[PDB]
């Protein structure tokens, strides 16, 4: 290397350790509300008293911020600077700071949060010392001028490099910069490391989470052509979707649902991956408000695919999980909706899974098959398995009404597959 770059690297090693007093009046004078002439003349104790003055109201809003009064907002936690500590102590400092950041990420519209984190900016240089968590916890607030102030103060990491033109700017950072920020690959590995961190800690609130799905979804919007870049984009999004569905949270569930919907509708995965998606979706479909979304997810999911075995029957674990988390009459209500969304490739696949494992509710299938105008090969492919359940399952009046409906609608289709399999008069010899 050069000497000058090898020495400007030591600026990055000691960007916060103020040695000359002008370095102090640079390093203390930037904070989240106060102008740098009044921010220059602030004693540490005076800022900590305002810190507790916002922190007590925050802890009274929810008690989880009370523990940072024990450690971070302690009255003993003023004089200690970071650079005086060992890195093993600095790691625990960063742990406290990070867990505080995703916590306060919800409460950030409050001026209590702005007055609380400004001291942490000023006591622990978290605009510089830990700026990846500062930005990742507070990324969704890109319209708010509190964040826009925060942009003029953060030493920008290479991972957040779209905003290199937006630090110390007037107008707020635009919506397209969020996509171009997220359109990088390793940025998405940071956003997994944020959201997965929020999942185990269960600090996942709705507005930021809607911003997550709107950014990830717009990423696959931007990668509609770059199918090889999309094929390295499946590992980052489907991991976030899977680890999202392990949440108790229902907004996180519909978030992972939107991820799977827009991902399958933008890029056709293999069928077995969609079966994995169905297992992870249905295996945590518990609360009510996610069911209406999650049904439409599989409605999209089975429509996103095409191949050999396009509408084949589901596995018995998958089908019994589906018929545990939904009833029959759930889908019997849903297909009679006036929205009536096109789950055409799902029904003709799921009725076969009824027709092999269960076989007990084919009056239900009659109700099902009168509801939806299906596809041409689909009805034929249902009728072949119903020929199979004519032959091997003992013939019953439910199947008689089934095939009488199938003579009422597309008798000749039945005649063609019967000329393919079996005979015509032998099907009259069925019942």
């Amino acid at each position: 290397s050069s000497l000058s770059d090898q020495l400007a690297q030591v600026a990055s090693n000691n960007a916060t350790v103020a040695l000359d007093r002008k370095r102090r009046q640079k390093l203390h004078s930037a904070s989240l509300i106060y102008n740098s002439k009044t921010a220059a003349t602030q004693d540490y104790d005076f800022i900590f008293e305002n810190a507790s003055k916002a922190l007590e109201e925050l802890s009274q809003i929810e008690p989880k911020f009370a523990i940072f009064s024990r450690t971070l907002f302690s009255e003993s936690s003023i004089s200690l600077d970071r650079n005086v500590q060992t890195k093993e102590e600095i790691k625990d400092l960063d742990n406290a700071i990070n867990a505080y950041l995703l916590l306060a990420s919800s409460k950030w519209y409050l001026a209590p949060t702005l007055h609380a984190t400004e001291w942490l900016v000023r006591r622990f240089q978290i605009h510089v010392k830990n700026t990846e968590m500062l930005l990742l916890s507070t990324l969704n607030y890109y319209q708010t001028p509190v964040f826009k102030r925060i942009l003029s103060i953060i030493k920008l990491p290479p991972l957040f490099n779209c905003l290199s033109n937006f630090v110390r700017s007037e107008k707020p950072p635009t919506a397209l910069t969020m996509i171009k920020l997220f359109n990088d690959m390793d940025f998405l590995k940071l956003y997994t490391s944020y959201l997965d961190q929020c999942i185990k800690h269960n600090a996942t609130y709705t507005n930021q989470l809607l911003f997550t799905t709107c950014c990830f979804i717009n990423v696959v919007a931007f990668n509609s052509n770059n199918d090889e870049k999309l094929n390295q984009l499946v590992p980052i999004l489907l991991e976030i979707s899977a680890k999202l569905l392990a949440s108790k949270s229902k907004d996180c569930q519909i978030a992972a649902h939107t991820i799977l919907v827009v991902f399958a509708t933008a890029l056709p995965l293999k069928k077995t991956i969609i079966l994995a998606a169905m297992e992870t979706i249905l295996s945590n479909l518990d609360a009510k408000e996610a069911k209406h979304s999650a049904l439409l997810t599989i409605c999209k999911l089975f429509q996103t695919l095409k191949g050999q075995g396009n509408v084949d029957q589901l596995p018995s674990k998958i089908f019994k999980l589906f018929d545990s988390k939904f009833d029959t009459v759930s889908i019997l209500t849903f297909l009679d909706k006036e929205d009536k969304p096109v789950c055409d490739k799902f029904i003709t696949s799921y009725t076969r899974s009824i027709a092999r494992y269960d076989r007990s509710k084919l009056n239900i299938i009659l109700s099902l098959l009168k509801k939806i105008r299906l596809e041409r090969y689909e009805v034929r492919l249902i009728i072949t398995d119903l020929i199979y359940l004519s032959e091997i399952l003992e013939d019953k009046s439910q199947l008689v009404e089934l095939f009488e409906y199938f003579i009422s609608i597309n008798e000749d289709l039945v005649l063609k597959c019967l000329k393919s399999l079996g005979l015509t008069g032998e099907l009259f010899e069925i019942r």
Binding site: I67, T71, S74, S76, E89, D92, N95, A99, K200, H201
Partner: protein
């Protein structure tokens, strides 16, 4: 002749003791 904790509690503020404060710094990981 030991100290109590309440004389230690004013010693902890008076002597500049951070070891208990570093304990609470190092205490918690994913507390919810």
């Amino acid at each position: 002749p030991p100290p109590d904790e309440e004389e230690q509690l004013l010693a902890k503020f008076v002597f500049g003791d951070t070891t208990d404060l570093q304990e609470n710094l190092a205490k918690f990981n994913a507390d919810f």
